[PDB]
């Protein structure tokens, strides 16, 4: 690749619907809006 951008934050796993594409919630609207113009993959993980 020419660049590798990683955006990370803490978020509960019960709220996957608030980050799915097409969501109308306040979290996408005011906190985090994903680019979706470059090949991207959003993963949900638990870190020990």
């Amino acid at each position: 690749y020419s660049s590798l951008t990683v955006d990370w934050f803490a978020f509960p796993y019960a709220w996957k619907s608030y980050l799915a594409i097409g969501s109308a919630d306040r979290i996408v609207r005011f906190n985090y809006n994903q680019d979706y113009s470059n090949p991207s993959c959003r993963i949900h993980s638990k870190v020990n």
Binding site: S17, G22, A24
Partner: protein
Amino acid sequence: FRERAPTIMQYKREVFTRCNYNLSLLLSLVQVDEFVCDKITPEALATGC
């Protein structure tokens, strides 16, 4: 949101005509677990006739 919840065997249906809604009010009363949508998105449900 303010009545007895219907069963799946006898579910309720309401058809809305000639009225104005406000989807931002309805999304605060619920916590959404999953939405499965065809040919539309909830952000499109927020705006359109």
